Design a protein around this ligand. Structure first.
Ligand code: FFO
Ligand code: FFO
Ligand code: A1AQW
Ligand code: A1AQW
Lengths: 453, 462
């Protein structure tokens, strides 16, 4: 044993599984709005000797020896993050150690709030994220609703837009110390200036969780939350097309001085995390450099066009979209008026290599059996899909939904639905026929990453 | 732009830094006890298309479509973890989604405790970890002392061993709901049976944080905490030699039998642990890390690993023997595991100064707290570990040579200390003084010529 044997020689079971997943990604219409295809260059840094290093602390102030190279990598990642978002280093700092998006948000709360201090985020079924303080009527779900006191704000149900007037009314009574502007399943742009007004009136910090839209912000194809936010968090693996990781941006310098920096860094380490994952930090720096290029603006412009084309195609086939369209990378389809639930839709489409996720819609009370379906353009746009290609995607989807509707008319419970798809010979044949056409269409496009893993 | 370009071509600035770190690892004597050199096979899974997948939930019950293969990977990882520690699947389950060791411990507390419930861990300067509830006299340091109420247990400073009697005394008064058995800088074996006795008397859960010793446990070269513990957490990147990640093991199945109804009373850990990891604390699982861990766990079930782990014990003992022959003080007087903790206060040198001098000589360790220390930034000790260099085929005689180099560097550091006052001056002197810099450059060349002769797991160039 040398530790230098290749994966294919030393663990053929695992190596097969890797090829199977790579093939699955190549042959399918991958429409999960929070997924993307990472470049090989970033993946090569992710799987490197940087895994081996403990470097707790911050550059030039570490708790271990031997950190001179990872010091330069971390410093380089910080600089590339600021450049990518066109930030003045005298006005903004960045912490690049959060393991992912959820740890990044929890660190912001721990840094700025005492236990049981008050936060406000968009309610999950209305499009907010778990870590924005989500609890249901029956149960505190996110730890951000356990260690802190959360009250949600809501969409206007008639329009599908955030009700900024009701947010302002309730914020005066609830008195949050922090308000979160960021979404997981909202197809429109956020009025960050109006959020700033509310925060200024009640003396709350404004945190922008731009995880989903960060790549679009870097390419400057949509307005930037950095103009109005006190703190900005993001993941690096959605529209930024990087490895899985998180980032915290914070204002520094003179406000009228800002005191975010020391508290944010302390909350990440030593308070919440242990040793940084230097392989992820390096992979993030690689993707951030790619995001500064005119190539990336062109990609992000195409992401917007492809999502609009997808939405237009769905609207003309009679589908209901939450908020009536899109201004970003995703669409949220409310299947309730079509007579199908998100769980059944996700399953049928998955069987024909169309990959999405079921999603809550306004008014839903179950996330396991919700009424909607979320679709995103980023991943397939990275395979050079164009508007007409997304119009074809929508043809394939309708075709799968119609199969799902027919199976629903012949079954009662969800277990019956799932079994029927596999056992009925007639349905199985239409499924395979559609599957073959989808996979033949998808495999023709290029795919970022390694060729076989 | 394809996204298929190599790192060396598309980002030479990053690629050069990668190679400098690779070369630094090859040329140095890497003695950080919590570090190791991951195999190439695990690294190939770490840098894979598995990075691209969202698969929140657990196998069979996902919140996203397209999870058929990652389901198989997550299940395979769970099976290999159980096999690696010889665990009956009817009595033990494992959660393989924690991003690292600190998130693993935080999930356990969140699963089993309400906010402000009581925990007890070994005090940090005594060898316990940050996430075992550490708070100082002046501030709450770990979030495990903010969201929960902690009280530390301590070492018998006479013997350097955990004072089990004092733990029993204080636990009866403090009434913890959970006691943590596990350490970051303790060279002896933990009496888990005595831990369990205390827990049973006060009705506390017993959590074993075996992060540092997990590889030794898997190889069955030291007694296993699974016999007495309710919950077991570990990292995968120390003695297990894998990618950076965490694991949570928990008991399942029958706990007792109701004597009147004759029926089984089950453990209730599984659903709470799984819920605390997701949806409560984490978001999307890092499937590339999970796959890399499964690769490392399979390597741990081989006879090669047992021999490796046995050699780690022998190398750490030979290094402790050599340090003792040369007049050095070890906390607890030696070691029974993979590390030694050197108390340099009797020699009149602090840990920050010693770390620096050795680092300039390509001897990489870390300064560390010792019993009675008040500062972690300027502690009295130096921690040394055998796992990383044992992965490079070092044997006991090679670790004896390592101690020779260490003694040379420490002696140069004492000389510089006599010539300087403040830490910034000691440090500047190492680069300014032509003589000192020539002594350091001479020792460095010898160190690197010795270290480069040994093999290195991983890729050859990154
Ligand atoms: N708007 C929105 N959509 C999203 C997310 C989100 O955070 N916000 N997700 C995040 O990335 C994914 C879904 N993740 C979720 C997982 C669990 C629960 C939840 O409330 N679980 C409860 C209740 C389950 C039920 O009874 O339906 C539980 O586990 O008990 C919600 C969202 C994808 N879609
Ligand atoms: N016994 C033990 N040794 C260990 C660790 C540990 O958790 N336990 N570490 C864990 O991986 C590393 C060191 N990490 C640490 C980081 C910060 C502090 C700390 O107390 N920081 C305070 C006070 C600093 C001072 O003034 O000295 C702070 O930052 O405010 C301690 C240990 C290596 N050695
Ligand atoms: C606004 C926002 N903020 C934070 C996170 C957490 O990201 P992680 O999954 O913890 O890496 C997410 C994840 N979202 C996953 C999804 O939408 O499918 C998010 O939409
Ligand atoms: C017992 C125990 N438990 C948990 C952790 C945290 O592991 P992470 O650094 O969060 O991966 C550690 C890390 N220790 C790092 C060190 O000792 O240098 C540990 O010794």
């Amino acid at each position: 044993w040398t530790g230098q044997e290749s994966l294919s020689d030393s663990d053929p079971e695992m190596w097969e599984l890797l090829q199977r997943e790579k093939d699955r990604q190549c042959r399918g219409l991958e429409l999960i709005a929070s997924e993307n295809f990472c470049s090989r260059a970033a993946l090569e840094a992710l799987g490197s000797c940087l895994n081996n290093k403990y470097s707790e602390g911050y550059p030039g102030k570490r708790y271990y020896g031997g950190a001179e190279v990872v010091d330069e990598i971390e410093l380089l990642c910080q600089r590339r993050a600021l450049e990518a978002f066109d930030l003045d280093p005298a006005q903004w700092g960045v912490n690049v150690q959060p393991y992912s998006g959820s740890p990044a948000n929890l660190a912001v709360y721990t840094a700025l709030l005492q236990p049981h201090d008050r936060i406000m985020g968009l309610d999950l079924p209305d499009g907010g994220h778990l870590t924005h303080g989500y609890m249901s009527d029956v149960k505190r779900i996110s730890a951000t609703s356990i260690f802190f006191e959360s009250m949600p704000y809501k969409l206007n149900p008639k329009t599908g837009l955030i009700d900024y007037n009701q947010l302002a009314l309730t914020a005066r009574l609830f008195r949050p110390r922090l308000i979160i502007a960021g979404t997981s399943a909202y197809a429109r742009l956020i009025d960050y200036a109006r959020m700033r007004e509310v925060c200024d009136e009640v003396k709350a910090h404004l945190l922008a969780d731009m995880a989903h839209i960060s790549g679009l912000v870097a390419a400057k194809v949509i307005p930037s939350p950095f103009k109005h936010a006190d703190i900005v968090t993001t993941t690096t693996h959605k529209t930024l097309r990087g490895a899985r990781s998180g980032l915290i941006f914070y204002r520094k310098g003179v406000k009228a001085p800002y005191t975010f920096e020391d508290r944010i860094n302390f909350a990440v380490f030593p308070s919440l995390q242990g040793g940084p994952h230097n392989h992820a930090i390096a992979a993030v720096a690689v993707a951030l450099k790619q995001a500064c290029t005119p190539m990336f603006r062109e990609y992000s412009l195409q992401v917007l066009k492809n999502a609009r084309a997808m939405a237009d195609a769905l609207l003309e086939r009679g589908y209901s979209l939450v908020s009536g369209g899109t201004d970003n990378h995703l669409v949220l389809v409310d299947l309730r008026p079509k007579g199908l639930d998100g769980a059944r839709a996700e399953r049928v489409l998955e069987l024909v290599s169309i990959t999405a996720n079921k999603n809550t819609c306004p008014g839903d009370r179950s996330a396991i059996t919700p009424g909607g379906l979320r679709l995103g353009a980023p991943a397939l746009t990275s395979r050079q899909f164009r508007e007409d290609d997304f119009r074809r995607v929508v043809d394939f989807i309708d075709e799968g939904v119609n199969i799902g509707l027919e199976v629903k008319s012949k079954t009662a419970k969800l277990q019956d639905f799932k079994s029927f798809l596999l056992k009925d010979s007639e349905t199985s044949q239409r499924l395979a026929n559609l599957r073959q056409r989808v996979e033949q269409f998808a495999r023709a496009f290029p795919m970022p990453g390694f060729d076989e893993h």
